Design a protein around this ligand. Sequence first.
Ligand SMILES: Oc1ccc2c(c1)CCN(c1ccccc1)[C@@H]2c1ccc(N2CCN3CCCC[C@H]3C2)cc1
Ligand SMILES: Oc1ccc2c(c1)CCN(c1ccccc1)[C@@H]2c1ccc(N2CCN3CCCC[C@H]3C2)cc1
Lengths: 221, 224
Amino acid sequence: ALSLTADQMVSALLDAEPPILYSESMMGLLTNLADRELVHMINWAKRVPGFVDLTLHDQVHLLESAWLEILMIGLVWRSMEHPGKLLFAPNLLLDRNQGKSVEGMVEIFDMLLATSSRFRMMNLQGEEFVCLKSIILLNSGVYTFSTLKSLEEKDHIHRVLDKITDTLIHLMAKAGLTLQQQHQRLAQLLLILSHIRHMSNKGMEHLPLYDLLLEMLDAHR
Amino acid sequence: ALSLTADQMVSALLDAEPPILYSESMMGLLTNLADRELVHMINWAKRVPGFVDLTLHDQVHLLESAWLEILMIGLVWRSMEHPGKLLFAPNLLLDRNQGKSVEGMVEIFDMLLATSSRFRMMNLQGEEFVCLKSIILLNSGVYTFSTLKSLEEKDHIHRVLDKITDTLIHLMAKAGLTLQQQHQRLAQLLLILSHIRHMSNKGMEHLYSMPLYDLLLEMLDAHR
Ligand SMILES: Oc1ccc2c(c1)CCN(c1ccccc1)[C@@H]2c1ccc(N2CCN3CCCC[C@H]3C2)cc1
Ligand SMILES: Oc1ccc2c(c1)CCN(c1ccccc1)[C@@H]2c1ccc(N2CCN3CCCC[C@H]3C2)cc1
């Protein structure tokens, strides 16, 4: 995981991508969809290089912090060449007007559209996207875990995150961006993660979970 | 503003730094302190390179999204040398015992400590801190503004952000960090901003249940 080339990390991440799921009241549909996405997110996480070095208990706490942001970054990714619209599933596409029954998601809806438009303008690549999704998984919960060794289990998370930063920069050098453009784009991308956090907390207010993730993360062949 | 050097950007920000204010019910003392800090943050915000270039309403929008993250990162910065404690004021230092008696503080107290101790482990420099703050100001509100004119204002904000990113990097080079170390530290800092947005969202949920656009509108006009 520390030992991977920047290229094997990208390849490991591309090839771990979850499938795009189909749709099956509006909030019923979205809830059914998300709940099925969750199962696949657990499988993706276990293949994020470095995640499975962690203790089971730290894997749960990280996924518990991060799961909504992960569904959102997904959604925004597949909505990208779909201006004005959210592609929840290839058979459930909603325009701005169609959050006109689900009160509340109206703030969120516009926030996701804006995130999607931003990825569009930046010309966000899939290799970059899987790097950013991996950072959310490692980061969202890292500041919310302190015996001494405890802090050593945190340090490894930060080693892996540095390793994903090296990877994003490597992909940027490869495409021939200057050292200055490299730094600027990396920052633009990391700053968008502030906004995805904001969206998840507003989403959480509008929406135990530990057991559910713990049972799912623990699977018998 | 886009003409600035890294060093001149730094000098502008350092010069614009608000003073550290004193405390005069614990929630009562904190409200009164943050309310007086808010006047100084307008003064500071007006001297962030690129901020006065924006329309009045864009300026209000940004301060509306950011002000509480700006109070928290200031808090966390002056708290760096006080493990277990939050230095709200030089005469108002709270530890965990006081911290559980303050409503709204109960979720965020440990998040604030963690941020402080993280800045403490990383040895954040004052030149780095003033850059992260300006970034918060220009970034927090930038994806919750769709006209052609709005597209041009967001373009500006994003160009000003690229020049603060440049300044952060220049500073790390100067301090002798390798290129790798430079990117790595850039990301670690920008990732902590994500946690500062989390704590603001949490803190905000409490403060809103205890009109801001119009108060900051009148404060930016009063600065005239
Ligand atoms: O890919 C998706 C799928 C669904 C959603 C999003 C992306 C992004 C936006 N989101 C949302 C969040 C809050 C309010 C309105 C919409 C829905 C979504 C809907 C429901 C859920 N939940 C419902 C309950 N269930 C509880 C068990 C754990 C998972 C959780 C998922 C998650 C996301
Ligand atoms: O530098 C400071 C000063 C005070 C505070 C912080 C940093 C960081 C955390 N914070 C807080 C947050 C939630 C619950 C309890 C305390 C207090 C703080 C207290 C009050 C306010 N408010 C009170 C009401 N007032 C309403 C008018 C607009 C400004 C707003 C400021 C802001 C921060």
